[PDB]
Design an enzyme around this catalytic site. Structure first.
Site, mmCIF file in Angstrom:
data_model
loop_
_atom_site.group_PDB
_atom_site.id
_atom_site.type_symbol
_atom_site.label_atom_id
_atom_site.label_comp_id
_atom_site.label_asym_id
_atom_site.label_seq_id
_atom_site.Cartn_x
_atom_site.Cartn_y
_atom_site.Cartn_z
ATOM 1 N N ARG A 195 -7.860 -3.322 2.401
ATOM 2 C CA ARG A 195 -6.704 -4.245 2.761
ATOM 3 C C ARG A 195 -6.188 -3.335 3.962
ATOM 4 N NH1 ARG A 195 -2.414 -7.974 1.973
ATOM 5 N NH2 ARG A 195 -0.273 -6.791 1.671
ATOM 6 N N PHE A 206 0.772 -1.338 9.875
ATOM 7 C CA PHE A 206 1.564 -1.132 8.550
ATOM 8 C C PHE A 206 0.873 -0.024 7.829
ATOM 9 C CE2 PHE A 206 2.759 -3.336 4.457
ATOM 10 C CZ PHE A 206 3.450 -2.597 4.248
ATOM 11 N N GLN A 246 -5.237 0.532 2.997
ATOM 12 C CA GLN A 246 -5.133 0.354 1.459
ATOM 13 C C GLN A 246 -6.349 0.659 1.067
ATOM 14 O OE1 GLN A 246 -2.097 -1.838 -0.356
ATOM 15 N NE2 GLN A 246 -3.496 -2.164 -1.918
ATOM 16 N N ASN A 266 0.909 -0.175 -6.062
ATOM 17 C CA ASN A 266 1.004 -0.453 -7.562
ATOM 18 C C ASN A 266 1.166 -2.150 -7.610
ATOM 19 O OD1 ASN A 266 4.028 -1.005 -7.339
ATOM 20 N ND2 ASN A 266 4.325 1.224 -7.139
ATOM 21 N N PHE A 321 -2.443 4.036 -0.349
ATOM 22 C CA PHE A 321 -2.475 3.502 1.126
ATOM 23 C C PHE A 321 -2.086 4.622 1.945
ATOM 24 C CE2 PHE A 321 2.192 2.631 1.539
ATOM 25 C CZ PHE A 321 2.629 2.381 0.173
ATOM 26 N N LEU A 370 9.693 0.798 1.758
ATOM 27 C CA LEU A 370 9.001 0.891 0.298
ATOM 28 C C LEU A 370 9.481 2.078 -0.352
ATOM 29 C CD1 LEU A 370 5.629 0.776 2.004
ATOM 30 C CD2 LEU A 370 6.650 -1.077 0.682
ATOM 31 N N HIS A 411 7.330 3.184 -4.598
ATOM 32 C CA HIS A 411 6.323 3.481 -4.293
ATOM 33 C C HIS A 411 6.234 5.133 -4.333
ATOM 34 C CE1 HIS A 411 4.185 -0.299 -3.617
ATOM 35 N NE2 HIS A 411 5.065 -0.559 -2.635
#
Length: 164
Positions: free
Chosen positions: A54, A59, A62, A101, A112, A121, A125
């Protein structure tokens, strides 16, 4: 002192380059040792040969799902899941390495790399490392993802291990 691990990246089999990471074992020892051990493969399983499933440009990139290769698997060296160790460190900018997660205390093997400051985040995370060399290779990988995360090329971790 804090360990360094590397990933050699390949795009459809072709070599792209190497990214090196410092892992903050001084601040998140349990989370960093899980990533260290999955990069050397020393408990018998780990990241070598797995792919980045991904990548959302602007951004993050991942990966870490070495069992289903799509975001639905992976496992830690401590079991299926382990807890959020702490949230001392924050997502301050490009290069931050953080755990993906599925909710509170569900860390497995997915991670990531941020390519932007992603302050929303923080506290959701666990941050545990950062890109030491090869940020330019992460930018180059970033160019094969899209707004829904799907990649146009297969991005794999062709080799990986510990440098320091």
């Amino acid at each position: 002192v804090n360990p360094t691990v590397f990933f050699d990246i390949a795009v459809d089999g072709e070599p792209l380059g190497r990214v090196s990471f410092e892992l903050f074992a001084d601040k998140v020892p349990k989370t960093a040792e899980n990533f260290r051990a999955l990069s050397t493969g020393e408990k018998g399983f780990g990241y070598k040969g797995s792919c980045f499933h991904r990548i959302i440009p602007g951004f993050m990139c991942q990966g870490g799902d070495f069992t289903r290769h799509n975001g639905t698997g992976g496992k830690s060296i401590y079991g299926e899941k382990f807890e959020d160790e702490n949230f001392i460190l924050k997502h301050t900018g490009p290069g931050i390495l953080s755990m993906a997660n599925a909710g509170p205390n569900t860390n497995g093997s997915q991670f990531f790399i941020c390519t932007a400051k992603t302050e929303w985040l923080d506290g959701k995370h666990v941050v545990f490392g950062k890109v030491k060399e090869g940020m330019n290779i992460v930018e180059a990988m970033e160019r094969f993802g899209s707004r829904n995360g799907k990649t146009s090329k297969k991005i794999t971790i062709a080799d990986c291990g510990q440098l320091e």
